[PDB]
Amino acid sequence: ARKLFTPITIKDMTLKNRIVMSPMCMYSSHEKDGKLTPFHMAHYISRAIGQVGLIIVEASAVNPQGRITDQDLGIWSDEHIEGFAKLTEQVKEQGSKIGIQLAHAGRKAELEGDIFAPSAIAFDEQSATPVEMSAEKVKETVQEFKQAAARAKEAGFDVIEIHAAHGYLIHEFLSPLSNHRTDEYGGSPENRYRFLREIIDEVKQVWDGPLFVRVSASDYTDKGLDIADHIGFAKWMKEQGVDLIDCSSGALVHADINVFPGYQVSFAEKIREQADMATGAVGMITDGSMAEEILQNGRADLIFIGRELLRDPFFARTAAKQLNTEIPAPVQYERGW
Amino acid sequence: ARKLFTPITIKDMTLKNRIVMSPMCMYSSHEKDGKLTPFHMAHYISRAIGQVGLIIVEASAVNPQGRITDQDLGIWSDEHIEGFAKLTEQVKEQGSKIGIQLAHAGRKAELEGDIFAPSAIAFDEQSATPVEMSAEKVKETVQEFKQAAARAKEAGFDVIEIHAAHGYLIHEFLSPLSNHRTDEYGGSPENRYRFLREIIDEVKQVWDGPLFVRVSASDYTDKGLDIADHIGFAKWMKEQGVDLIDCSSGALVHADINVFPGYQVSFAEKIREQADMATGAVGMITDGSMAEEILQNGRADLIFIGRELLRDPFFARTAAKQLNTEIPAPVQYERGW
Amino acid sequence: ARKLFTPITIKDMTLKNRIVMSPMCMYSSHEKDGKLTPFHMAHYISRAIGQVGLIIVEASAVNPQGRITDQDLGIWSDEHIEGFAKLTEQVKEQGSKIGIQLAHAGRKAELEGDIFAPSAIAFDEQSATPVEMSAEKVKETVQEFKQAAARAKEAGFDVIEIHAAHGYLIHEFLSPLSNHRTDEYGGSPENRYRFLREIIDEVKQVWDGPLFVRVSASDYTDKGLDIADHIGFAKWMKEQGVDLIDCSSGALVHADINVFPGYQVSFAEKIREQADMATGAVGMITDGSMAEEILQNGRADLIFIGRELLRDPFFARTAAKQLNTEIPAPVQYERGW
Amino acid sequence: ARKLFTPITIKDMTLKNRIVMSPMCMYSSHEKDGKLTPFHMAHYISRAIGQVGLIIVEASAVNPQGRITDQDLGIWSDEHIEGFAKLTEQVKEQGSKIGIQLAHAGRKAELEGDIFAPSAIAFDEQSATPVEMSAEKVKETVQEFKQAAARAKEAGFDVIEIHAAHGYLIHEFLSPLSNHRTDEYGGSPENRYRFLREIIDEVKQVWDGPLFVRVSASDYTDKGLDIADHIGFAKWMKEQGVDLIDCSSGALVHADINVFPGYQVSFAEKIREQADMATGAVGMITDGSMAEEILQNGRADLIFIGRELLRDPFFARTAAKQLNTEIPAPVQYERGW
Numbered sequence A, B, C, D: 001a002r003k004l005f006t007p008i009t010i011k012d013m014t015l016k017n018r019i020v021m022s023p024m025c026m027y028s029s030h031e032k033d034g035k036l037t038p039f040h041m042a043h044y045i046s047r048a049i050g051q052v053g054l055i056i057v058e059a060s061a062v063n064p065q066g067r068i069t070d071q072d073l074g075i076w077s078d079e080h081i082e083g084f085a086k087l088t089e090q091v092k093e094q095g096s097k098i099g100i101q102l103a104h105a106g107r108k109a110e111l112e113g114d115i116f117a118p119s120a121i122a123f124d125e126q127s128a129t130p131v132e133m134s135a136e137k138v139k140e141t142v143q144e145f146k147q148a149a150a151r152a153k154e155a156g157f158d159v160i161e162i163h164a165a166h167g168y169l170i171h172e173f174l175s176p177l178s179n180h181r182t183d184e185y186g187g188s189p190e191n192r193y194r195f196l197r198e199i200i201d202e203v204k205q206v207w208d209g210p211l212f213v214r215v216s217a218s219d220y221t222d223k224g225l226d227i228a229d230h231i232g233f234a235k236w237m238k239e240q241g242v243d244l245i246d247c248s249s250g251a252l253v254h255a256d257i258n259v260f261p262g263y264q265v266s267f268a269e270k271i272r273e274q275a276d277m278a279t280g281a282v283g284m285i286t287d288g289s290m291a292e293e294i295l296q297n298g299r300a301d302l303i304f305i306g307r308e309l310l311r312d313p314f315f316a317r318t319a320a321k322q323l324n325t326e327i328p329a330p331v332q333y334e335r336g337w
């Protein structure tokens, strides 16, 4: 069969194909309480009916002031568990595995009131200047990622992804452009990686299954992080037991980025080869042929699809047709697929 | 713009486009009680996110012994109202109008215990011989359609469609191949149409909104009904206030049917022209170009899509692209559509 | 199989499928002598490699002053025979049948010097007023169509089509908007049809093969011709032995025309049914599904494709795939098709 | 603009886009004299109308007994010049550049009579055992490549490609699996490369423009050539002035090859990076998105397309649409493209 439709086992989890629905915020928690709504249920469950191997739920805030917007999903309260338990059960019933992206927006939070970051440096001229987190607050935030992971386990998720990309809180600590701290969380690469190191270790105290980390593999900026820095972080993550690195890029600060089909694939390939770490490729992958090429040429292990799944929730069927292969159809749609 | 994406008003109901999700059984009421399940919610709401103008819910039985299978949806009990009320609210919130198809499978019911029909004639060699309904039983069934319509109104549906096609109960009364009665419900075309006439009049006593009737416009069998018979029934339905005839065909008995793209369109165009009745075209319509041609050449008023919406829930977007035109995207997907 | 790919016989000519390359001017006779050039050869032969059943060569003038532009192909001279003989041999060797459209642009000729028409009425504000043809000149033109048909027979064409559409000479005689004559060629519908009647009878004196006539089935103008007029002309053409009417529309004068997929199909279906004449459908037909529907619903006998064959010379292969059916590939491309 | 539609200059030749029609035998020289036929003219010229930047004519034999089949094109005689001169002129007139692949089938020639190779080893059990070329015959063959290059220059080609792949004569000398010679043309990599070295040097005596060499970058066989061997040959070719290496693979002997979209791209990327040589990628590249990714990620400089151009001669237009960009249309097709 085609590699895109070949299984892969990570820890005790077996994915039936290599297609992953990339985490994508829906800004649909209209009651501003981080809870799920019927829209979210239909949105996610339809891609499970659509046969996506693994569906990663959008950035879910570990603290309310870590939301990107006040309509974001949250996982900062035990009240969020009931809704997620229904979602995981329904997605798995349709045949898919499900994960959740744990997040904190840091200086990119678009909320009223103080927002937080490793250093008091604004994202851009249109943004509020964040408050530098005290060491106590940094440690409390590590505990919030741990507590959120425990809630995700209770809710029944199969995979937990740590959002260490797109200019959000963890990425701000990793990069010298945004982290000018003079304590244990700033300076050397070891100190800049410390926040993420502590989050991974603490999450591992309450969660043993698949652990993914999404990174922005380059800042595309002078004096910022580049792929060499991320290969270094990837080797430390492998030592800590991270199972896969989801390779994105950018958004710490505004930058000129040449976007084209597969523009982030080189990051996934280099981290996979140099850090001996399984990787997820993402970024303008819109068809089965490219997905198959990426996997067959050993550039990544999982293919993350974002916008094409917004256009075609049944991308798995489309890709199977493009690759002239067959895949099981949801039972209810057998006189159509 | 494109006619397919131009609004149309029927009664006090305005549809934002002319794409209709044809009713399609999901055989997913697992507890055998006719109730909705989470799968049904995701299945239907996803096409509302997908911008279908009107979603018609699958054949819903007006009597438990009128189900096609024991996993069918039902609307024979007030217990069914709560679930439908949630479904109509959620589909409408996503921007579509919603209808329900009221049904009774007659001699094609695949259930244990006596099944019913206008005459004791089995569908085929592998089916049970049905019990000839007494006139009392026929009248009780008319009241069940009325009671089901009252529940549909309470549950918030925008449109009610009467299932008078596909060899089910009403179609069995209409055709001389299946109706050999010698009382007021058989013999002449007027008497064979009487059951449907009474259902329409009684439904109108509790429902003043858009009323559609789905017919099988031909039996494709010698001595059976053909399009001329249906043009006659359509004129009678127009006098009774039916708003649109959804034009399907076949399934009263096994028959050789030549299927091809648009194979039932001639029925919709002839009834539209000769009975001066709005019509719905359905049958192997899978792309926007054909849909637009049907509407622009005056062959039908609404385009019903079945299997293509099982392969592509977002057919509206695909058709808009094929017709090189722009349509609003659900707000959550503006970055992908 | 699919009707689009089923053979059809007209006279002693069997077409392997029902796809026709509609005549389309290439404005490529650079020496202004009406002769073929290497571009024309590649242009036409490539669609024969592409499996089009019948290729109709673009409007070819029967008189030099009847060209639309000075870069048009011509068939007014015996010097044109040699080039056409090579083209017909080469297209037929690749497996297709070939036709030629005999033409005279009348008042729409974009040439210096006097241009001709049934009456001295200009096409529009930016066009020269034509010279009213004397009866002698009309008769000379009928002989030029006859002489051109004899050359087409000598050159090896399988089909001859008379261009009586698009506001050109014959169409100008047919319509009361452009023909104000008071002699035998004007006044009544019979007199307005006389020029075409004489062309058909004279062509039949030198050609006994398939004879097609392309018409503009409506002028889309008050007091102009409409489909009822053309159904009448079609009955007369049937009596004269015309084999098929290629149904186009418009262009006699500027008019508002609503264009959409299949916008001229109603003309082909009405002439086919009411005049009992085989018809060719043309106009925004771009996919196999629509083509198959037109044929299966009895709206036309042949499907003419214009612009889609300019975008996709191998439309036959694309349509076969869309219809999930197999067709023979040119032997040279068996490893790709 | 997109890199696929960005120009590139090689020597004095500027290609308007990066799409190349890969050389593909047509087995259509039916008179068995190696001459062109009308089919070849339409076949090649149509892809020039289709806007392919560079069209490489199929393997053309430098000696009649070096043909793969007796219906192959040839360039072993001055009689072949006239036909090629017409083809190059017509392809360039449509806006494309044109090249020719100089070839000798060696032990894979399917001809009657003795066939030749570096050693008397048959291709497989179904093939004739070739005659080991004497050193004099090897030197005569080098002169035949030189003489053929002179004919190609006279005929007006813009690029000459040497066919050193697919198990044919030059590849047989390069590989230890097929070359067991004990003279100056066998043994060490220097001796095995000598035949190709002499061909390149001699061709350079009569041809200064763009010179491409197509190689099979792996034999996929134990003790055969692999990418490391070809990076070595590529460095020697760069020293000799070869402008680009067209990277194919296989066919020296039967082997198990895992084929998938982009399966030969790694060879193009490694030779480009390690030998600082421009490269052509080929092998199951069927869409614009993959073509763009290959170019943007620096894996190759030109994208060679084979079978997709047999299915879609106007692939350039299709790819431009896929990449949401615009490209000039052939003038004759402007109301269609």
Ligand SMILES: Cc1cc2nc3c(=O)[nH]c(=O)nc-3n(C[C@H](O)[C@H](O)[C@H](O)COP(=O)(O)O)c2cc1C
Binding pocket: A022, A023, A024, A025, A026, A058, A059, A101, A163, A165, A166, A214, A248, A282, A283, A284, A285, A304, A305, A306, A307, A308, B332, B335, B336
């Ligand atoms: C509407 C929208 C919301 C997104 N939200 C998130 C998010 O919550 N977390 C994340 O890591 N990436 C997010 N992304 C980035 C996507 O997951 C994905 O990495 C990006 O769109 C590149 O892939 P694509 O070209 O397949 O869309 C979002 C993208 C879109 C279009």
Ligand SMILES: Cc1cc2nc3c(=O)[nH]c(=O)nc-3n(C[C@H](O)[C@H](O)[C@H](O)COP(=O)(O)O)c2cc1C
Binding pocket: A332, A335, A336, B022, B023, B024, B025, B026, B058, B059, B101, B163, B165, B166, B214, B248, B282, B283, B284, B285, B304, B305, B306, B307, B308
């Ligand atoms: C799985 C399935 C279930 C269906 N159930 C129903 C139904 O409940 N009511 C009905 O009137 N037609 C039913 N149909 C028929 C469809 O509504 C539709 O008329 C038919 O499939 C022709 O349209 P299409 O070619 O667009 O699918 C069903 C079809 C399918 C494939």
Ligand SMILES: Cc1cc2nc3c(=O)[nH]c(=O)nc-3n(C[C@H](O)[C@H](O)[C@H](O)COP(=O)(O)O)c2cc1C
Binding pocket: C022, C023, C024, C025, C026, C058, C059, C101, C163, C165, C166, C214, C248, C282, C283, C284, C285, C304, C305, C306, C307, C308, D332, D335, D336
């Ligand atoms: C470039 C071009 C040239 C044409 N020249 C002719 C012609 O010589 N004769 C004719 O009858 N129609 C001519 N037409 C009209 C076409 O044959 C065809 O009827 C029209 O384009 C409608 O079909 P389509 O939508 O498949 O293109 C031409 C159309 C185009 C685009």
Ligand SMILES: Cc1cc2nc3c(=O)[nH]c(=O)nc-3n(C[C@H](O)[C@H](O)[C@H](O)COP(=O)(O)O)c2cc1C
Binding pocket: C332, C335, C336, D022, D023, D024, D025, D026, D058, D059, D101, D163, D165, D166, D214, D248, D282, D283, D284, D285, D304, D305, D306, D307, D308
């Ligand atoms: C019918 C056919 C003939 C071919 N003849 C040649 C040839 O003359 N020279 C050559 O180098 N490759 C030849 N090939 C290989 C192609 O140029 C190309 O490298 C191969 O098909 C891989 O590319 P694709 O997947 O885009 O077709 C041929 C392929 C086909 C299908």
